[PDB]
């Protein structure tokens, strides 16, 4: 399962 | 043996041709099992292996929602990186990201990974400690400062030691008949005369899984590394892979060459000669 959406670059 | 799970993200801008496209694919070892594509008529995370189809609706909803959110985060991120490098609005650019975990035969975490690239060059990578960062340049240092300020590494560590390992173990059990099965290569040596003076010996390996393999030619027992033409390992389309190694030999000396094949599916390494 995918990792939770993280911070933008 | 050991196993891995990896997600591969590609985000690609295309000015004048709509908004940047976001693609995600998931693998266990060399087996793709999901995909997402923001260009699809209705984007969703979708099955690509039979053993994932049994996951329930909240699984597919969670993996779809994160991917749509990622579509927007990567669009913003492409805008930020264009700024960091002082780049024009008119050019196309790519962010890639590669993350996942390795587990050993007992299912224990061996190590985690999270690396990013920008236009095909290393940008930022989570260190093996899952706590610090390596930035490739002063632009990536701006991203590092953001991510430290936001405690990103701890979020990645929690995922890589938790969900990543737990779901990999779940997948390996649900797909045991294939994910835990190594298929040995079918091998043989062909002979292609070039002239009266030399011929090509080609050592073939077909139908093997996983992709990892070593094919080497020896002459009088000595490896012919510089002289061996290796082709890149290639998928057959049926989950298996193919590879060959070739060497040009003096006519009449063919029997001094042996091909050696190591692969996880093999009882023991193979030694082949040309059999005319």
């Amino acid at each position: 399962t995918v990792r939770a959406s993280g911070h933008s670059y | 043996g050991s196993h891995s799970m990896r997600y591969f993200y590609t985000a690609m801008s295309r000015p004048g041709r709509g908004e940047p496209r976001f693609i995600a694919v998931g693998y266990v070892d060399d087996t793709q099992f999901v995909r997402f594509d923001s260009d699809a008529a209705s984007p969703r995370m979708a099955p690509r292996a039979p053993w994932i189809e049994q996951e329930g609706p909240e699984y597919w909803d969670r993996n779809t929602q994160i991917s749509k959110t990622n579509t927007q985060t990567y669009r913003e991120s492409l805008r930020n990186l264009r700024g960091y490098y002082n780049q024009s609005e008119a050019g196309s650019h790519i962010i890639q990201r590669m993350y996942g975990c390795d587990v050993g035969p007992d299912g224990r975490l061996l190590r985690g990974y999270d690396q990013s690239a920008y236009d095909g060059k290393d940008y930022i990578a989570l260190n093996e400690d899952l706590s610090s960062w390596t930035a490739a340049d002063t632009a990536a240092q701006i991203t590092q400062r953001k991510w430290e300020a936001a405690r990103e590494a701890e979020q990645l560590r929690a995922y890589l030691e938790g969900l990543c390992v737990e779901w990999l173990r779940r997948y390996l059990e649900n797909g045991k008949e294939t994910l835990q099965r190594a298929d040995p290569p079918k091998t043989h040596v062909t002979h292609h005369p070039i002239s009266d003076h030399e011929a090509t010996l080609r050592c073939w390996a077909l139908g093997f899984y996983p992709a990892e393999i070593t094919l080497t030619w020896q002459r009088d027992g000595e490896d012919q590394t510089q002289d061996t033409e290796l082709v890149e390992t290639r998928p057959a389309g049926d989950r298996t892979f193919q590879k060959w190694a070739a060497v040009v030999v003096p006519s009449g000396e063919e029997q001094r060459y042996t091909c050696h094949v190591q692969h996880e599916g093999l009882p023991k390494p193979l030694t082949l000669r040309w059999e005319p």
């Binding site: - | 590609t10 693609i23 790519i94 890639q96 236009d119 095909g120 290639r234 998928p235």
Partner: protein
């Protein structure tokens, strides 16, 4: 912005011989960026219903794709793969070398 040109391999899923159902493969790897045009040719004509794998990439960040379609090889029918990419001035043609 770095650019890498595709490697191209044309081959059959199974050992080829006439009359039997097989799969013809064109595998492009090692390229950057990811936009690429790939066709499969049968005596110079573009085969219509060619599928391809989902976009992924290797450890060195270069992209790879498998293009394939079901076919049946004959003694006469000729097969090839045509590839265009920003690194290439003209499309590249690679013929299916049946034996090697």
């Amino acid at each position: 912005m770095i650019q890498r040109t595709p490697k191209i391999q044309v081959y059959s899923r199974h050992p080829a011989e006439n009359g039997k159902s097989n799969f013809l493969n064109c595998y492009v790897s090692g390229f950057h960026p990811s936009d690429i045009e790939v066709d499969l040719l049968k005596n110079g004509e573009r085969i219509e219903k060619v599928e391809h794998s989902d976009l992924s990439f290797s450890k060195d960040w270069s992209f790879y794709l498998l293009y394939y379609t079901e076919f049946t090889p004959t003694e006469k029918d000729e097969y090839a793969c045509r590839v265009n990419h920003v690194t290439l001035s003209q499309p590249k043609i690679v013929k299916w070398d049946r034996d090697m």
